[PDB]
Design an enzyme around this catalytic site. Structure first.
Site, PDB file in Angstrom:
ATOM      1  N   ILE A 122      61.898  55.482   9.002  1.00 19.08           N
ATOM      2  CA  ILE A 122      61.310  56.339   8.190  1.00 19.08           C
ATOM      3  C   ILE A 122      59.786  56.456   8.169  1.00 19.08           C
ATOM      4  CG2 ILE A 122      61.558  57.781   6.005  1.00 19.08           C
ATOM      5  CD1 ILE A 122      63.708  55.748   5.472  1.00 19.08           C
ATOM      6  N   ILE A 123      59.088  57.486   8.408  1.00 20.07           N
ATOM      7  CA  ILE A 123      57.641  57.741   8.564  1.00 20.07           C
ATOM      8  C   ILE A 123      57.349  58.606   7.083  1.00 20.07           C
ATOM      9  CG2 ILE A 123      55.659  58.929   9.325  1.00 20.07           C
ATOM     10  CD1 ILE A 123      58.754  57.670  11.424  1.00 20.07           C
ATOM     11  N   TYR A 173      62.290  67.832  16.775  1.00 21.71           N
ATOM     12  CA  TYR A 173      62.515  68.818  16.106  1.00 21.71           C
ATOM     13  C   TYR A 173      63.423  68.415  14.941  1.00 21.71           C
ATOM     14  CZ  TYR A 173      62.972  74.028  15.825  1.00 21.71           C
ATOM     15  OH  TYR A 173      62.918  75.280  15.689  1.00 21.71           O
ATOM     16  N   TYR A 180      63.796  78.826  16.158  1.00 17.00           N
ATOM     17  CA  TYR A 180      62.840  80.128  15.527  1.00 17.00           C
ATOM     18  C   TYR A 180      63.582  81.359  15.719  1.00 17.00           C
ATOM     19  CZ  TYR A 180      58.922  76.459  15.651  1.00 17.00           C
ATOM     20  OH  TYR A 180      58.200  75.341  15.345  1.00 17.00           O
ATOM     21  N   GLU A 225      56.039  70.487  15.561  1.00 15.27           N
ATOM     22  CA  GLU A 225      54.845  71.270  16.540  1.00 15.27           C
ATOM     23  C   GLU A 225      53.630  70.541  16.547  1.00 15.27           C
ATOM     24  OE1 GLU A 225      56.593  72.590  18.637  1.00 15.27           O
ATOM     25  OE2 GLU A 225      57.442  74.577  17.816  1.00 15.27           O
ATOM     26  N   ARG A 233      54.115  67.455  18.590  1.00 20.11           N
ATOM     27  CA  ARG A 233      54.168  67.878  19.944  1.00 20.11           C
ATOM     28  C   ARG A 233      52.668  68.213  20.597  1.00 20.11           C
ATOM     29  NH1 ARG A 233      59.230  72.241  19.799  1.00 20.11           N
ATOM     30  NH2 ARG A 233      61.025  70.806  20.063  1.00 20.11           N
TER      31      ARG A 233
HETATM   32  O1  LIG Z   1      59.825  49.750   8.298  1.00 18.46           O
HETATM   33  C1  LIG Z   1      58.901  50.495   8.037  1.00 18.46           C
HETATM   34  C2  LIG Z   1      59.242  51.531   7.100  1.00 18.46           C
HETATM   35  O2  LIG Z   1      59.248  50.740   5.706  1.00 18.46           O
HETATM   36  C3  LIG Z   1      59.730  51.517   4.674  1.00 18.46           C
HETATM   37  O3  LIG Z   1      59.745  50.825   3.690  1.00 18.46           O
HETATM   38  C4  LIG Z   1      58.370  52.582   4.408  1.00 18.46           C
HETATM   39  O4  LIG Z   1      58.608  53.255   3.302  1.00 18.46           O
HETATM   40  C5  LIG Z   1      58.350  53.365   5.641  1.00 18.46           C
HETATM   41  O5  LIG Z   1      57.173  54.311   5.449  1.00 18.46           O
HETATM   42  C6  LIG Z   1      58.039  52.582   7.040  1.00 18.46           C
HETATM   43  O6  LIG Z   1      56.986  51.846   6.920  1.00 18.46           O
END
Ligand SMILES: OC[C@H]1O[C@@H](O)[C@H](O)[C@@H](O)[C@H]1O
Ligand SMILES: OC[C@H]1O[C@@H](O)[C@H](O)[C@@H](O)[C@H]1O
Ligand SMILES: OC[C@H]1O[C@@H](O)[C@H](O)[C@@H](O)[C@H]1O
Ligand SMILES: OC[C@H]1O[C@@H](O)[C@H](O)[C@@H](O)[C@H]1O
Ligand SMILES: OC[C@H]1O[C@@H](O)[C@H](O)[C@@H](O)[C@H]1O
Ligand SMILES: OC[C@H]1O[C@@H](O)[C@H](O)[C@@H](O)[C@H]1O
Lengths: 262, 259
Positions: B5-6, B77, B120, B173, B176
Site C-alpha cells: 500500500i502506497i 489502472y 473512459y 495516468e 504513466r
Molecule cells: O510496508 C510498507 C507499507 O507499510 C504500511 O504500514 C504503510 O502505511 C504504507 O504506506 C507502506 O509504507
C-alpha cells in the site's frame, strides 16, 4: 517470450542546425560524400534512410558508410556488400548519438552550414554529433516548466525562471534534433553551460560551437542532462528569485525537475 | 497475503507529498526492472502470479476519510476501490481479470462489482467528458469523499464515475506519464483545480499506442507516426522516442525484448 519486431522505418535524419543527412547531388556512386542539406519536404531518396534490421542506414540500397579514403573519418554512401561491413553498421542512440560501433566513432557535422560533409568523430556528445531519426524536421517548440510550475525564460544571453505567461515568446523553446535547446526569439543561440563543473551558471550563447555544453538530453526522470559532464539543469537554491539556473550533480529534487509543456 | 500500500492524503498535500506519492506508485509497479529506451515497462500480465498482480493506494483527505483504490500492476489502472466496509469493482473485460479482482478486498462482505467497466468510454458515458471534469487537490478531495459514501447512498453513479476518473487521471495516468504528473503538480502547487487539456487527454488515449510504437521501434525510430496534440488542441506527429522519454514513465508490456 514472443519477441518484438524490427520495423525498419524509413526516416530522415536531422542534425546540426536542423539540416538533414543528405546524399550529395543525388549521386549514388560508391564514395559520394554524405552531407548536411536543408531538409526536403518531397520524397527524394537522397534524404530518406531505411533503418534495416542489420544496423545499416541505407538510402536507396546504398549504405551510410565510413570512407577509408585518404585523410579518412569521412562519411559517404557506398555499396552495402562492396563496403567493409563494419563501416556500414551503426547504432542510433536515445542520447541522440549515431555511432559506428566498429570504430567507436560517431557521426558528426563539423559545421552548421549547408553542404558540410559528414565525418565520423570521437564521441564527446557535442551538438555537432547529435542526430534524430524523425520525418519531423521542425524544432519541437514548447515551454520548459520547472520549479513552482515556473517557466524557463531567456532575455539576451541570460536565462532564468519566471512565472509562465500565455503570450511571452521569451518562454518559448525550440528543441532541435541535435540536442540543442534554443530560444524561439533567436534560434542562432543556445542553452549553454560554458563549463563542466558544479555551480556553473547556464547562459544563452551562440550555437556556432555546437559544443558539448550546448547539447542536452531530457531524461526519463524529468531532468535535463548534459551527456558530456553528466550534470543536470538545476534552479540554484531552489530559489527562482536568484534568476539563475545552474548545472549540478543530479539529486532529483523538484528544482532539477523539468517538463516540456507543449 | 496482502498487497503493498502506497499512501497519499489531500490533507495539506504539497507538490512534494504528491511527487513522492507518484514515484512511490511507480516504484511499486516497476520492481520488475525491465526498461526500454529509458522508459520502464510494466510487469507482463501473461503468467503474472496473482500474488503480485495488484498494489493498493490508500487515499485520505481533509475530512479524515480513506478509500483504497486497487491498481493493476499490469497497466497502473484502478480496477476497484474499497470505501471502509464496502468494496466495489469495475466490470472486468475478460474472464482472466474477472478472476483476479476477486482476490482484492476479500474480508469485505459488501464487496460487489458493477455492470460497467472502468474505461473512459464507459465512465464518460456515466459521468461525462474527461475534458469537463476538473482535476486538482480539490476534486480528488471530494472524489475521495464520494467514493467513501457511495455505499451509504451518498454518491450518485455519474458522480461515482467522475470521482473515479479524477483518481485515475490524478493517479494512474500521472504514474504513466510524468507529463500528467507534472500537470497535477502545477494544480496542487497553486490550489488551482482544472480540466485535462487536449495534450493530457490525448496522452491518456495514446498510452497503448505509445507503449507499442516504442517497444517495436528499430532504434527509437517508429514504424509509423503516433499523433499527439499540444495544449491548444493542434495535433503533431512523433516518429521518434527521444521526444517522449521525458513524457511517458510507464509502458504496458507488449512483447519480449530481442535477446
Ligand atoms: O510496508 C510498507 C507499507 O507499510 C504500511 O504500514 C504503510 O502505511 C504504507 O504506506 C507502506 O509504507
Ligand atoms: O513508403 C514510403 C513512405 O515511407 C515512410 O516511412 C516515409 O516517412 C515516407 O516519407 C515515404 O517515403
Ligand atoms: O547540390 C547539392 C544538392 O543537390 C540537389 O540536387 C539534391 O536534391 C540535394 O539534396 C543536395 O544534394
Ligand atoms: O548495387 C550495385 C552493386 O551491387 C554489388 O553487389 C556489386 O558487386 C557491385 O559491382 C554493383 O553492381
Ligand atoms: O543491383 C544490381 C547489381 O547487383 C549485384 O548483386 C551484381 O553483382 C551486380 O553486377 C549488379 O547487377
Ligand atoms: O552500454 C552503455 C552505453 O549505452 C548507450 O545506450 C548509452 O547511450 C550510452 O551513454 C552508454 O551508457
Amino acid at each position: 517470450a514472443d519477441v518484438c519486431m524490427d520495423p525498419e522505418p524509413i526516416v530522415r535524419i536531422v542534425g546540426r542546425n536542423g539540416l538533414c543527412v543528405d546524399v550529395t547531388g543525388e549521386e549514388f556512386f560508391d564514395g559520394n560524400p554524405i552531407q548536411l542539406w536543408p531538409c526536403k519536404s518531397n520524397t527524394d531518396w537522397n534524404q530518406l534512410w531505411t533503418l534495416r534490421k542489420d544496423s545499416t542506414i541505407r538510402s536507396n540500397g546504398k549504405c551510410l558508410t565510413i570512407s577509408k579514403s585518404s585523410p579518412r573519418q569521412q562519411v559517404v554512401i557506398y555499396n552495402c556488400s562492396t563496403a567493409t561491413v563494419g563501416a556500414t553498421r551503426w547504432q542510433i542512440w536515445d542520447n541522440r548519438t549515431i555511432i559506428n560501433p566498429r570504430s567507436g566513432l560517431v557521426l558528426a557535422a563539423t559545421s552548421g552550414n549547408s553542404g558540410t560533409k559528414l565525418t565520423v568523430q570521437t564521441n564527446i556528445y557535442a551538438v555537432s554529433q547529435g542526430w534524430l531519426p524523425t520525418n519531423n524536421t521542425q524544432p519541437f517548440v514548447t515551454t520548459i516548466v520547472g520549479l513552482y510550475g515556473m517557466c524557463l525564460q531567456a532575455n539576451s544571453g541570460k536565462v532564468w525562471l519566471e512565472d509562465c505567461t500565455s503570450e511571452k515568446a521569451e518562454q518559448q523553446w525550440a528543441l532541435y534534433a541535435d540536442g540543442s535547446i534554443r530560444p524561439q526569439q533567436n534560434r542562432d543561440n543556445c542553452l549553454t553551460t560554458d563549463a563542466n563543473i558544479k555551480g556553473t551558471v547556464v547562459k544563452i550563447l551562440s550555437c556556432g560551437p555546437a559544443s558539448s555544453g550546448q547539447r542536452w538530453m531530457f531524461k526519463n526522470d524529468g531532468t535535463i542532462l548534459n551527456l558530456y559532464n553528466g550534470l543536470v539543469l538545476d534552479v540554484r537554491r531552489s530559489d527562482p528569485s536568484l534568476k539563475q539556473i545552474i548545472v549540478h550533480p543530479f539529486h532529483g529534487n523538484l528544482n532539477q525537475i523539468w517538463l516540456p509543456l507543449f | 497475503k496482502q498487497y503493498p500500500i502506497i499512501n497519499f492524503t489531500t490533507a495539506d498535500a504539497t507538490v512534494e507529498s504528491y511527487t513522492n506519492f507518484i514515484r512511490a506508485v511507480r516504484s511499486h509497479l516497476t520492481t520488475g526492472a525491465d526498461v526500454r529506451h529509458e522508459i520502464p515497462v510494466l510487469p507482463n500480465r501473461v503468467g503474472l502470479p496473482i500474488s503480485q498482480r495488484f498494489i493498493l493506494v490508500e487515499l485520505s483527505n481533509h475530512a479524515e476519510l480513506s478509500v483504497t483504490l486497487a491498481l493493476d500492476v499490469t497497466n497502473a489502472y484502478v480496477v476497484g476501490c474499497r470505501a471502509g466496509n464496502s468494496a466495489y469493482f469495475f466490470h472486468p473485460d475478460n474472464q482472466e481479470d474477472a478472476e483476479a479482482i476477486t482476490h482484492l478486498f476479500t474480508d469485505v462482505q459488501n464487496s460487489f462489482t458493477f455492470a460497467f467497466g472502468g474505461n473512459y468510454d464507459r465512465l464518460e458515458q456515466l459521468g461525462g467528458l474527461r475534458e469537463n471534469i476538473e482535476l486538482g487537490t480539490g476534486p480528488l478531495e471530494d472524489a475521495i469523499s464520494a467514493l467513501y459514501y457511495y455505499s451509504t447512498c451518498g454518491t450518485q453513479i455519474p458522480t461515482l464515475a467522475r470521482s473515479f476518473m479524477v483518481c485515475i487521471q490524478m493517479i494512474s495516468e500521472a504514474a504513466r506519464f510524468q507529463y500528467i504528473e507534472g500537470e497535477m503538480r502545477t494544480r496542487i502547487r497553486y490550489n488551482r483545480r482544472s480540466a485535462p487539456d487536449p495534450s493530457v487527454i490525448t496522452l491518456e488515449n495514446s498510452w497503448g499506442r505509445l507503449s507499442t510504437a516504442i517497444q517495436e521501434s528499430n532504434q527509437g525510430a517508429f514504424a509509423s507516426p503516433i499523433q499527439l496534440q499540444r495544449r491548444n488542441g493542434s495535433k503533431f506527429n512523433v516518429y521518434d522516442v527521444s521526444i517522449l522519454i521525458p513524457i511517458i514513465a510507464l509502458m504496458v508490456y507488449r512483447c519480449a525484448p530481442p535477446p
